Amino acid sequence: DSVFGSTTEVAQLKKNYFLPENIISNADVTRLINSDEIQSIVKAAGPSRVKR
């Protein structure tokens, strides 16, 4: 924790170094896609591979 620090606290052994931030917060995208927040507004899913 002194070599690297955190995203909000500077590293002690690296002057002016903060751990990189991510452009995604929860990288589990299946959790977001299959969440109650999202699945409650999407339209009724069409079929999978459709019949000819």
Partner: protein, 49 residues
Amino acid sequence: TFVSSTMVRAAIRNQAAQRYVNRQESKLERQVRAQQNVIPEDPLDNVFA
């Protein structure tokens, strides 16, 4: 009507004269701003520490 040919040399020397000082002022202000732009520590970040 305008200045000596050496005054142009003085003009460019005065332009660069503030280059060092402006760098020092800009560096100092950046550090002061970064000191005041500190994210407050979460009271729960060291709960398991």
